[PDB]
Nucleic acid binder design. Structure first.
Ligand SMILES: C[C@@]1(F)[C@H](O)[C@@H](COP(=O)(O)OP(=O)(O)O)O[C@H]1c1cnc2c(N)ncnn12
Ligand SMILES: [Cl-]
Ligand SMILES: [Mn+2]
Ligand SMILES: [Mn+2]
Ligand SMILES: [Mn+2]
Length: 534
RNA sequence: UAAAUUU
RNA sequence: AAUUU
């Protein structure tokens, strides 16, 4: 029946001017050569994104869906949740959050300026007194960096972000925040993926894998999941929120926000014109993440039941899931995934790329990452998390007047410290750069480079400094991504690392600790590394 | 724009 | 601040 969007025809305009690369990239031109492949998505491409996300939805539910939906509500009723004092909600606003149309921004909100507090009270009044008038939203194209990919189109068109004014964002938090903190875990138990750390997510996947007699795994993602959300899904989302114990005042707000904001509304471009109308998920709302995850979980568990997946063990993070189950032979397994995918499609959550059963944990990707294995110091298998380095390397080379990528290097160094690509490429380059700038003591996004060894031990285990014998997949992929971006091959990084290492040792202090721990892989005479006080 | 995780 | 979705 219903259509995800409708368009006035007005353009999707830019928040401000969009930054462009320069003829020299001083920080990254030693990292990689092919800067022509590094691009940032712009509003210029917004029109194309709109076409791909505008389409007719038809949903057909069934006993399996209904049964799951029932069970989820008997779980939701164990949750009691409170309102948030207008003030408490203001304090959860992020520092640089986009300012309101009504002459105040986040400085004012977080500091509880009177004008801001007053407007907000007024907006929350209106939610209580009017449960129908659509709330207007702004639509913008997100600016994100990527490496080109001819196999999949050349250059991706920009994601569309749709969000209400700042006043409404706070009110949302008042009504819903406590719920967002309690509901998912109460509904999905151990299947709620955002609860876990990267290490726990690995322990969990392995425990699941291990406890089957004959494991079969797969992953599923939905194509433009936000468009696939039906008006009805969003209302079913409401009724799940209401299953909790709630202040009467919340209920009225939840319902008002549902009917006015969440199921749809008009859209205005940054220059002010009417741009279109919306009958699906808005990316910009508080319930976007919770809602996606619950809704995906409902459909997925229903589909599991439609398709006969035996003994499923799930993991859901938004529209991304992994099911680990007992194989029924490859013949039946292939049949059931086909079924799973039909069921999901009938529920209006069709796949980007249809899924496939797999029988090796390394071959299951989800959230653009996967589990792999290498050998540890004493020769035991050590399982860990990694990904295609293509994007991180591309983002590593995004240098603009306004933007430096050094923060991104560090972010990826920490998150992925056991990965061969971090250890040989990013680390070498990061430390090489700061040594020459002579800025190791300096703080990057409130982290001290010289704390890395400690930081990494806390997070990844001392094994992170001594791992070796990486998988064929991981070696092939790293090699292939450095070749793709015109970076030196690993052998060259081996050389650079030795040099960096020696230089770091020269300086003594914490610098030499970094030199010895982070770069021990690079030497012939590997020094025995023990735990670190810090 | 929203959230989660990491610091 | 980073990353993910
Ligand atoms: C907008 C989304 F709902 C998106 O559809 C959903 C699934 O992620 P993905 O599978 O990567 O993207 P599509 O399925 O939409 O192609 O997660 C939310 C999402 C992703 N990114 C952002 C963001 N930057 N802000 C807010 N929400 N959001
Ligand atoms: Cl070991
Ligand atoms: Mn998706
Ligand atoms: Mn209601
Ligand atoms: Mn996804």
């Amino acid at each position: 029946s219903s259509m995800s969007y409708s368009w006035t025809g007005a353009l999707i305009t830019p928040c401000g001017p969009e930054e462009e690369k320069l003829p020299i990239n001083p920080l990254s031109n030693s990292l990689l050569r092919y800067h022509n492949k590094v691009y940032c998505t712009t509003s210029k491409s917004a029109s194309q994104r709109a076409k791909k996300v505008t389409f007719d939805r038809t949903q057909v539910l069934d006993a399996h869906y209904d049964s799951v939906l029932k069970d989820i509500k008997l779980a939701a009723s164990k949750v009691s949740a409170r309102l948030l004092t207008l003030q408490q909600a203001c304090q959860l606003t992020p520092p640089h959050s986009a300012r309101s149309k009504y002459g105040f921004g986040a400085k004012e909100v977080r500091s509880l300026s009177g004008r801001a507090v007053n407007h907000i009270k007024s907006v929350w009044k209106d939610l209580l007194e009017d449960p129908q008038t659509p709330i207007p939203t702004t639509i913008m194209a997100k600016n994100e960096v990527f490496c080109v990919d001819p196999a999949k189109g050349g250059k991706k068109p920009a994601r569309l972000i749709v969000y209400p004014d700042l006043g409404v964002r706070v009110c949302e938090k008042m009504a819903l925040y406590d719920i967002t903190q309690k509901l998912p875990q109460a509904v999905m138990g151990a299947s709620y993926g955002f609860q876990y750390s990267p290490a726990q997510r690995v322990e969990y996947l392995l425990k699941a894998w291990a406890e089957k007699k004959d494991p079969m795994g797969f992953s599923y993602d939905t194509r433009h999941f936000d468009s696939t959300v039906t008006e009805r899904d969003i209302r079913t989302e409401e009724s799940i929120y209401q299953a909790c114990s709630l202040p009467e005042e919340a209920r009225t707000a939840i319902h008002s926000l549902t009917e006015r904001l969440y199921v749809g509304g008009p859209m205005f471009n940054s220059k002010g014109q009417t741009c279109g109308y919306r009958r699906c998920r808005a990316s910009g709302v508080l319930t976007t993440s919770m809602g996606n995850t619950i809704t995906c979980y409902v459909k997925a568990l229903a589909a599991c039941k439609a398709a006969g997946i035996v003994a499923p063990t799930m993991l859901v993070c938004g529209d991304d899931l992994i099911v680990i189950s007992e194989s029924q032979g490859t013949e039946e397994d292939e049949r059931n995934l086909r079924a799973f995918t039909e069921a999901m499609t009938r529920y209006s959550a069709p796949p980007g790329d249809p899924p496939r059963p797999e029988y090796d944990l390394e071959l299951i990707t989800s959230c653009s990452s996967n589990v792999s294995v290498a050998l540890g110091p004493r020769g035991r298998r050590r399982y860990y998390l990694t990904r295609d380095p293509t994007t991180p390397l591309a983002r590593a080379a995004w240098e603009t007047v306004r933007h430096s990528p050094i923060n991104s290097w560090l972010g990826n160094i920490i998150q992925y410290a056991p990965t061969i690509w971090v250890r040989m490429v990013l680390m070498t380059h990061f430390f090489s750069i700061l040594m020459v700038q002579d800025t190791l003591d300096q703080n990057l996004y409130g982290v001290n480079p010289l704390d890395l060894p400690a930081i990494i031990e806390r997070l990844h285990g001392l094994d992170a400094f001594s791992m070796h014998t990486y998988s064929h997949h991981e070696l092939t992929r790293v090699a292939s991504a450095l070749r793709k971006l015109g970076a030196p091959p690993l052998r060259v990084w081996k050389s650079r690392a030795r040099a960096v290492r020696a230089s770091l040792i020269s300086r003594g202090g914490k610098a030499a600790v970094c030199g010895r721990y982070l770069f021990n892989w690079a030497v012939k005479t590997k020094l025995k590394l023990t735990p670190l006080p810090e």
